[PDB]
Amino acid sequence: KDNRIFQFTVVSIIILNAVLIGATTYELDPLFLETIHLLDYGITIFFVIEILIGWNIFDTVIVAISLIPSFLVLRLLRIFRVLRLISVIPELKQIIEAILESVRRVFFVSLLLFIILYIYATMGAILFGNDDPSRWGDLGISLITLFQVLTLSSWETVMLPMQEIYWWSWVYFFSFIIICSITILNLVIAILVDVVIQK
């Protein structure tokens, strides 16, 4: 089953058949397409067998849906047909299991992030509530905003408008940024440690 090459030109086929669809085809060497689809099929076959004889549940649910040759049912089929890539390249499996063990830790630290944001978004909706309501109006948007500021995406747009109405403006944001910036750091480290010990 394995072999690196094969699997690479197989990633190649799966992908190219996942990305053809379909508006970008108003013209092109249709024997080329015949062959890409044929091959694509030959693959759903390849593992549809190896299966014969936890991740096998997934393997066969996938391969089964990828077996089938509507507007949404179509797009789903596109999605599972591309999922069979995982069955194929078996390092992707070990990797997915790695993520999954990252999930507990990430879920905790994430709860922390939620605490931090809720605080800053309450203090924020209360502070910036009526001066710029599009971001601090209610608590939900307050959080969506603080979440933009967390990821440092054009955050000066949120802050400066408040900085010319309230001198202490940066203290709010920088502290916020800095505090979030710190705990992510411990998330990372924690996973590292948990990834090493677990060995």
Next chain:
Amino acid sequence: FFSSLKDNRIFQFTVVSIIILNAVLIGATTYELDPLFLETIHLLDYGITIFFVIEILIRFIGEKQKASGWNIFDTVIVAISLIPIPNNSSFLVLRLLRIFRVLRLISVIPELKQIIEAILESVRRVFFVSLLLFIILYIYATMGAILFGNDDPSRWGDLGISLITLFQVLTLSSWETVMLPMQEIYWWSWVYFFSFIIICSITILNLVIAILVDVVIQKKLE
């Protein structure tokens, strides 16, 4: 009966969920939702904090000598999250209680306290590197408020906005809009901005490495 349930992953997940939903659903932003469902979620949440008050009066009757920074944290977070009970409340002290109500999450999950102790530890390093960043910012924000001051006082008018500007640049946020105007005057503009970014980058980097090795010494390899 009670000493047992605080250790269940499914209970902690549903409870955490209820706490969050209870702290986020509010208040005229739901001026239309299944009032039956919110009624249920609130009634529950309060039920939960009842369940904590119980658990802790227990751990208390327990210490054979009735006399853990937690104990204080915990019973204050809970006493405060208990009786007061706010909602869509106009100003202004309850608005803030909502915050301790959500702080209960730490009471509901051990690894939260452990993670927090871990962070408080990372604070020494983060603070000294924060001094070094201050120095760098001050050097660049001064060269800057001197060089760029009469050209764009929007961002280099005084020392203060020069620093805010460079903090905006440190995080790489739309920094092309801070520099790119200086480039169409002073051709050296690039040297200034790039050097400051590279330097801040190197220092933040060495910080991360610092902390990483501190934790790493504090466990494995050996």
Next chain:
Amino acid sequence: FQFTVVSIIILNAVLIGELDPLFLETIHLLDYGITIFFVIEILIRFIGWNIFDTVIVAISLIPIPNNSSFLVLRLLRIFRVLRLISVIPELKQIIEAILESVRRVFFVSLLLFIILYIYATMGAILFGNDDPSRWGDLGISLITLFQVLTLSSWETVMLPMQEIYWWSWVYFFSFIIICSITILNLVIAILVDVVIQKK
């Protein structure tokens, strides 16, 4: 003691933006003398990287279009600047390190791809008709989600869909969260293969 040479090559590579009366030209002809002792040094060795030092040093050996062509002028400048790797050896290291990372990176990229296909679909279906400029087809759904993936001013992508569709954030936020965790794993995967050599 190398530095100087880096200086001549680098300099004579970024020099067109009205100075150095004719010292510009000393740097010219002199930056040309550099290649020749590699055209020679390379001969001096006999009885892998040489397929690179040879092709580069050699394409650096070719002269240059007068008041003419300009076609292959620029390609030539690229090779002339590529000699830097031939002379600096620590760069040959760096690059062997990079190419050692290329495999684990290839796999985790396949994975980020699957996430981007699922979200570019989920998302083209949801937002396809409210912002075809970002969501019209797969193509820009993938460019767009990739801009989000790099957190580059991504609140411009999401905030429109947040006026129309209350849940927008669940879509975008999970998209980011998922991506983050997976990228995270990779680093810690790589930053363990390398220490593996050490023990």
Next chain:
Amino acid sequence: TPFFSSLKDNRIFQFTVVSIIILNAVLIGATTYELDPLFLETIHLLDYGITIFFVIEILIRFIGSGWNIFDTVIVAISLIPVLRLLRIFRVLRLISVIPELKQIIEAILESVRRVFFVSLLLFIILYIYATMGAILFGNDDPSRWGDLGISLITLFQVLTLSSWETVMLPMQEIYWWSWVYFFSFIIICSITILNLVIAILVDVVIQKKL
């Protein structure tokens, strides 16, 4: 004469001395019209008292290496009343106060060799690219691809992921394959950088633990 060679080393006297440098560093001086005149005046006086104190310290420990040179040259400059760049030097006596900034600056200077090298590599990538796009998008959008200078500056902005769609998108609607140019560029840079971070890490643990 132990008083000094034994006072630069008090946690609390330190944080005091930083608070004061910093203050008499952030205050100076877009605002002194109203604020307790006696108070800012005081702040300058004791700030100066501080540097006088450091001068006495050195002499005193002297009487009984890079950091004595940087410490001597800085406390030396700080003693003075092209030159607006005076006040800058003084802020640097913080590093003379706080052993920790000394240790951290030392470790950063260890970072430099590898960083210079990787920056070479990234210079080479940015060059190949800014050249390729200097040709490709020069006649379509030239306030950022019109010459090597702006192609390199512009590719640096892309490289820090800052507002990058604004560079790439307007080329995307002229050329279908741009995504390939920008996306591959970014992936490359990323890979090389990740190899920097790690290399520096390895470096550091190889400075002790095996």
